[PDB]
Symmetry: D4
Subunit: 160 residues, 8 copies
């Protein structure tokens, strides 16, 4: 089935984080593509990817980047689609640079930013699902089931 979410990242090393988005989309049966696009080393690849995303049938882009993390914001500059950004944990600053580089977009070009690291990647997929669910009833039901199970599965007391 044709992809409706694009997951992009600058490097193979980012996939240790972004794989969590990939897995969650698959769990919710959301067709998607998962690609490497580097803002700094392949800027024309990024421009083409972002400019053509909507016409290719993508509805949401999930972009992960670390350090001076420009991939989500520059993707948003070229597409009218919602772009969700995942800050990848960086070695020295532990993703604080990633986070500020992604979330602090000036007024006019949004990036919906999730938590640093694997939690954020999982949540970017879930946020993409909640967006798609607004106009896909079958997915909405699967997401409802997912949320209800998550709630029902929380234990009542810890183990010593």
């Amino acid at each position: 089935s044709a992809p409706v979410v694009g997951i992009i990242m600058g490097s193979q090393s980012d996939f240790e984080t972004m794989r969590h988005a990939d897995a969650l989309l698959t769990e919710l049966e959301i067709p998607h593509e998962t690609l490497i696009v580097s803002a700094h080393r392949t800027p024309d690849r990024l421009a083409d990817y972002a400019r053509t995303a909507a016409e290719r049938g993508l509805n949401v882009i999930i972009a992960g980047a670390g350090g001076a993390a420009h991939l989500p914001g520059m993707c948003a500059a070229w597409t009218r689609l919602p772009v969700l950004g995942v800050p990848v944990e960086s070695r020295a600053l532990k993703g604080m640079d990633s986070l500020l580089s992604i979330v602090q977009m000036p007024g006019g070009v949004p990036v919906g930013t999730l938590a640093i690291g694997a939690s954020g990647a999982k949540n970017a997929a879930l946020l993409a699902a909640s967006i798609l669910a607004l106009f896909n009833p079958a997915l909405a039901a699967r997401l409802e089931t997912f949320r209800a199970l998550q709630t029902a599965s929380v234990p009542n007391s810890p183990i010593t």
Copy 2:
């Protein structure tokens, strides 16, 4: 027209920031409601608002809060709808507390987080518009026009 976006905030003082979301939705002719809901002072109001949002026909919630900013995350805990979070600038820590309290959601319950302050409020409304545009062609064309004008209006040189 029945609202499809809810803008909520904890206090009247937050409206100095959140009015920028309200104004943008009005500019794009997106029916919305703008309300005060305090996570800490009116937790049952929040629970009811979030639980019933989807059945009332809301599609996106934009929530702003400052300091120990819990409103967006608690809203997301009770609704399956996408929740967008705006960190309001706090007096002492200039919204760094707001930002971390909103963006660092654990895996399972997302909040798409925007920039600290007015830029974030504007961008939360634009992000909501881009979500709604996925299944509202007239709005999608208005959003295209908004982005095109924003791009075309940037001057080429600064004024002294």
Copy 3:
């Protein structure tokens, strides 16, 4: 004996930290309950827990959470009891997000916040003990003994 302190946390992983509160209450012979309550995944469980705590005979709630740490503040929103908050150390930001999310409560709904990590959990239990001691003379004597022994047990010189 019926519990007078409730220790709550969002996950099993938090218990590595919160076990230190549990142990200290037991050492001072303070009856308590230790439970998992997730602000984000079980918000109705939290509402019920907090709203009924006083009528169940609890006097103090100790709540631990990490990241976007909303459990202590939302517990405080629903109960009139004193709520003590323990920031759990987070992977990337080392509990700075936990701390700011808990301590920066706006005026009107307090959370007494302790240090990041195990020290904070131990101290939340000791602070709960000092509160209970105000109207329990036997406990006051046990706490006095504990403090005096702590002071008397400090060595006079380090070992090389």
Copy 4:
């Protein structure tokens, strides 16, 4: 009436913040004393104040300090009473120094820490009230009324 809460601060300039604690205790009719005690300039005054607090009939101490904020922690070192700490906003670091100096107490000697600034001072008084309410039924009813009014008074919509 004999004081049951002591509010202490290092300097006159701290009173701009700590007056909010004083006012709240007065509103709830909690007898208290409001004093200047400097950890750095009057350390023997502090030692005497803290050592004798319980025998004088105080039940809770609220201590405010800024910068290298040692007053709450040193007070706690000398009293078995609960000590609540208010970080005063500092000029350069906006209370981040105050906050870390107060909240990061090692295990064994607690300080329940509130938010930076006026919100923290108000909440320290409310937290003291919630402690006293555990064994003062008339006060407990006044605190219930305070919280109920706070909740009921939140507007439903913002004003322009």
Copy 5:
């Protein structure tokens, strides 16, 4: 004379900072152009500007941006010329976001980063001058004179 340095910035508001670079280049008689190029609002303008800079005869680009500051890094992605980056002071985070977004470039695509604000803009122009001086003897002598005067003009004692 044809420009050999390009000064670019995302918005008119950035010129309050970047005018200090413009003024310094004028003082040293370095032909330059001063332009608005927004990474987020005019990404194709940026791509064209950077791609063609060298063929137009530019030797150094000075780029200023604030918040999620992507302009310098994206410029560097498209040109082989040295790119110098000036973090513009942001309202909430005082340029800490600007700084991390610019300086933390991954290996392979450099941005030489200067201080936050006006000092950085002045120094970006001086750094550009020192680069050009390596192959322009007349300029090298003017830069020597500038540095010598700066050194000689420092007073020996402060004024009351």
Copy 6:
């Protein structure tokens, strides 16, 4: 020989850091004492230590502490001697809490603060030596020799 520097710390665990001060004083033949004094668990021991230091013949106190690091500042509150403070690296915040708790003393009561960790402990000893050298010519010569050797011993090129 009677001690002229006192090295104090709150716990045995601090000695992993403070041992570097101890060793440097011994290398420069400065008689000293090395003790455990806890600001929070032995506050009367601290008061007595600091109040009597000068009459016992101490000239400089080196105090190490971590977290909410109050030992150096409270020592300074009671003694007229110069007090040097060493921030001990803390687990979560890596000594940023230690540093701010020590260095940000309000006007009136100084602590000369050194770097976080072992470097700071070594430098506190060297700073104490430079103070003592002002009125001990033999020590001044030993310190001169130490500094000259340090300078002469720096290699000219690194090894691959």
Copy 7:
């Protein structure tokens, strides 16, 4: 009288801070010189000042700088005298850059660092006084009087 303390700073704008050191030394009748020495603009002036300080009869140097604050550390590199460092509050980062640039000296070359801003300047002068007092009995008595008055003058209650 010949100066025994040198107060140096990089620029006239630093004097707004460093004048508090000057005033304190004058109050205690400690002969001193107050000079501008810029590490970055007058590095040879600095090298000469520091190299010759001891032979001129200076005993302590107090150095203030902001931003990338190198003056105290470079002074310490060239003199065997104790160097005390005052971080001047910077516009954007409020002296956090100043503080880290001064306090984080590697082992071997100390700078005793005081608080950011005016408090630090006052305390640098007081710390210099406490050093000189170790071998100047008349000054030691004046410093005792200063500390005693500071302690005795603290009010017991705040004014409204």
Copy 8:
């Protein structure tokens, strides 16, 4: 061949980072020298190195330092050449002290600052290459080839 870039660092331990600059210059066939120069332990070596660099035929200096990182800024104080600064990751503060100490140079004396750690060292070499390429066509072609290969070598999809 005579060196045209000087790579300097304060210690052997810094070479684990600065070796990445050394390797990149060799890859691009840029003759260079790699030396240890300590700002704090060999300040006269630094003064001589920096003051004579241009007359020795150096065109660019790359300087690495950590902690209170003064080497790049003091090198820039004495040379008219462009100085590029590499913040070396520090143990406690993970290079945040290094970064602020290097990048926050006041107006008048620039240091072009690169990222914390190995990325920054690689990029300082690449930035030096882009500077030299402005007046060395053979190097410009090698740099073009390097950049084009970097772009062409980015994979299109990650591996699971």
